[PDB]
Amino acid sequence: FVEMVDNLRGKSGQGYYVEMTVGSPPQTLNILVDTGSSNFAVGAAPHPFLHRYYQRQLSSTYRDLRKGVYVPYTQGKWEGELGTDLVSIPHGPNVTVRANIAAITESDKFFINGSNWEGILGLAYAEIARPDDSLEPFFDSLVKQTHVPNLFSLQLCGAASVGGSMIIGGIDHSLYTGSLWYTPIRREWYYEVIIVRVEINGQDLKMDCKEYNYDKSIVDSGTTNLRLPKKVFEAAVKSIKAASSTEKFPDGFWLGEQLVCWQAGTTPWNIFPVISLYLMGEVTNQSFRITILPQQYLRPVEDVATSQDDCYKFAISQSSTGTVMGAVIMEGFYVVFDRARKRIGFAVSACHVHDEFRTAAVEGPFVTLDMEDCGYN
């Protein structure tokens, strides 16, 4: 799958995108890769932030579905017109499929001024598709119409410009070290998993594990942060804060309201502890654990126009909707979305940022009892 290695690009904090073509003749677009949504939606009018947009009028193969979509979210939205057309991935499998496309005709706070992408590829399942679950997501159409195996894998690197690989239809062993360990996909809507234990340097919050997954935990390449429920977030930073004394810095920093700054290269990684999540394993009472470094959750902030220093944002935050294993998590690992077997694979990424000290790890088996009690119902 060397064809596909390095087929993702991005800017720090602006997500990862892949090149796609739509219509006949093919229109090239850059498309955000999003495992936390299930719509394929592309800019189709000259919004000023956009380099490119889908021009349905230039496509023999376009077909109007004569139905609209309206996708609200916090302080923004997009809406568009549904049709279908022929879609392909130049640096992906050598196939063309007819997929649903939401032609985005209006949006607020969706596209990013200065970004190099023009749409979004929702890689999650039908259940959370808009307007409803009869709108077949792209990957379901791909698997259904070709001989591409029902899985994909992501290696998100990054360290302005980020980069990565999306392997469609398989796994590439050059992208990771050691062994893949798999957690079950609890239900096919989001890529929902179950966290059964969290340790913040070697010490668990010793809280009810039902709290780590209230009301969801998910794997989501379209979120930057590790995002933890309040109740867990509280305990979480309470522990990282106390871990990171002999260090010294504010109160709003931890609430992601104010960035922290050191002088070029003076960042003390090591007063911050590693963070380990234990995921339900494939076998009864068996777990495994993934361990991320401060460099994963302390991410460089790009355009600090009022500074020329070494400034980071704390990449953890609270949620009403559950745990979100965003890019902070994913960038330390090769992640296999093994849809065929309803499970997600984690291995140490061949491209993650380590040092000669500590390193992102994937380790098991551990013995963990009553893991199924950690799921919220």
Ligand SMILES: Nc1ncccc1NCc1cccc(-c2ccc3cc[nH]c3c2)c1
């Ligand atoms: N992945 C995801 N998680 C939670 C809510 C929505 C969601 N995806 C749909 C969505 C909606 C609005 C904005 C974005 C989005 C815009 C820009 C960027 C840059 C990096 N990631 C994003 C996500 C995604």
